[PDB]
Amino acid sequence: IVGGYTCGANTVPYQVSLNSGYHFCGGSLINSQWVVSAAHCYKSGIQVRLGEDNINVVEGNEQFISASKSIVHPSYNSNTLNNDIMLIKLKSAASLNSRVASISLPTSCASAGTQCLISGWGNTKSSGTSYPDVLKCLKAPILSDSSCKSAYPGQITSNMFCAGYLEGGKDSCQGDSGGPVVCSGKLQGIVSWGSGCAQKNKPGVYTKVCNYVSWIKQTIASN
Ligand SMILES: [Ca+2]
């Protein structure tokens, strides 16, 4: 997260870190056994880390649970990043509490202008590289489809939306990938892509979660 703020320990209880010996992506807990992340975060050997603040220190509220299965969206295209969504099932159900909690799926899509909370452990620099160890947060509005398409000609599909600031300086970044965009208590987006980070006229692009609720529910119901 570039130009954000320190969330505070366990203030974003649905935020998970995906770990393969190191943090590599964010995710969102959507029930006791399932996490939503980005398809471009797919790899084998995933451990889901819940209840994290400082990802380099055991602080007492963590649950570390290995993934039993991961399911990339059937229509994910790694070239275009269309359908950039995946589900990860935990080998055992997380113990849900005030600091480890699921986030609700949308019942309808969010509109341009809606304010959302974006979070993660990604790079905090727009030029250069600095990884924080505590969770960072950014409040950002969803942008209109037309401004999103104008920002990224030929690249925005019906499964993507832009959020952030066209002036630059405030954005998600590398390492925030797969993490949440939550608006009015609903998971509306997944950190997907962007040109650099926090660059003028290059806002963050996010997977449009409301398009996938039927797939998520049906997949969970049979796996
Ligand atoms: Ca920790």
DSSP states of the chain: -BS-EE--TTSSTTEEEEESSSEEEEEEEEETTEEEE-GGG--SS-EEEES-SSTTS--S--EEEEEEEEEE-TT--TTT-TT--EEEEESS-----SSS---BPPSSPPPTT-EEEEEES----SSS----SS-EEEEEEBPPHHHHHHHSTTT--TTEEEES-TTSS-B--TT-TT-EEEETTEEEEEEEE-SSSSBTTB-EEEEEGGGGHHHHHHHHHT-
Residues 114, 193 within the same domain: yes
Neighbours of ion ligand 1 (CB under 5 A): 52, 54, 59
Residues 6+ apart with CB under 8 A from 21: none
List Cα–Cα distances, 7 to 85, 116, 121, 160, in angstroms: 24, 14, 11, 25
d(CA 52, CA 99): 9
Q: Taking a C-beta distance cutoff of 8 angstroms, is the pair 91, 48 a contact?
A: no
Q: Which two tokens stand for residue 172?
A: 């998600």
Task: Give how many domains the chain has, as a whole number.
Answer: 2
Q: Tokens 């399911």 correspond to what residue?
A: 71
Looking at the structure, tell me whether residues 121 and 176 fall in a common domain. yes
Structure-token pair, residue 25: 């992506």
> Residue 76 maps to which CATH number?
2.40.10.10
Contacts made by residues 17-24, CB under 8 angstroms, sequence distance 24+ = 17/48, 17/49, 17/52, 17/55, 17/121, 18/46, 18/47, 18/48, 18/49, 18/88, 18/178, 19/46, 19/47, 19/48, 19/49, 19/64, 20/45, 20/46, 20/47, 23/49, 23/55, 23/121, 23/175, 24/175
What sign does the CA torsion over 66, 41, 206, 216 have? negative
Catalytic residue among 37, 102, 177, 192: 177
Question: Is residue 177 flagged as an active site residue?
Answer: yes
Q: Are residues 34 and 138 in the same domain?
A: no
Instruction: Say if residue 68 is in the same domain as residue 113.
Output: no
Pick the closest to residue 138 from 48, 51, 39, 15 (CA basis): 15
Resolution (A): 1.7
Task: Please indicate, yes or no, whether residues 4 and 20 belong to a single structural domain of this protein.
Answer: no
Ligand 1 center to residue 74 CA distance, Å?
Answer: 33
128 and 64 belong to one structural domain: no
Per the CB < 8 A criterion, the answer to whether 160 and 66 are in contact is no
Burial 1-40 (b: 16+ CB within 10 A, else e): bbbbeebebbebbbbbbbbeeebbbbbbbbeebbbbbbbb
9 Cα: distance to centroid of ligand 1 (angstroms): 10
Interatomic CA distance for residues 9 and 135, integer angstroms: 8
70 is catalytic: no
**Whole-angstrom distance, CA of residue 25 vs CA of residue 5:** 19
The annotation status of 145 as a binding-site residue, yes or no, is no
User: Ligand 1 centre and the CA of 103: distance in Å?
Assistant: 20
Q: Is residue 1 located within the same domain as residue 64?
A: no
Assess whether 7 and 115 both reside in one domain: yes
What tokens were used for 193? 């892509």
Cα(157) to centroid(ligand 1), Å: 36
Half-sphere exposure of 103 (CA within 13 A, CB side): 29
54 is in an annotated binding site: yes
Find the catalytic residue in 37, 84, 102, 119. 84
Same domain flag for 136 and 195:
yes
Beta bridge partners of 188: none
Residue 126, CB-side half-sphere exposure with 13 Å CA sphere: 17
* Catalytic residue (one of 17, 28, 40, 192): 40
Instruction: Kindly state whether residues 108 and 202 are assigned to the same domain.
Output: yes
Structural domain span for residue 74: 13-102+211-222
The side-by-side arrangement of strands in the sheet containing 180-183 is 5-6, 136-141, 115-120, 180-183, 186-193, 204-208, 160-163
Q: What is the dihedral of CA 82, 91, 51, 127, to 10 degrees?
A: -30
* 158 HSE (CA, 13 A, CB side): 2
- Indicate whether 115 and 191 sit together in one domain: yes
Same domain, yes or no, for 108 and 130? yes
Reference 64, options 43, 81, 50, 79; nearest CA is 50
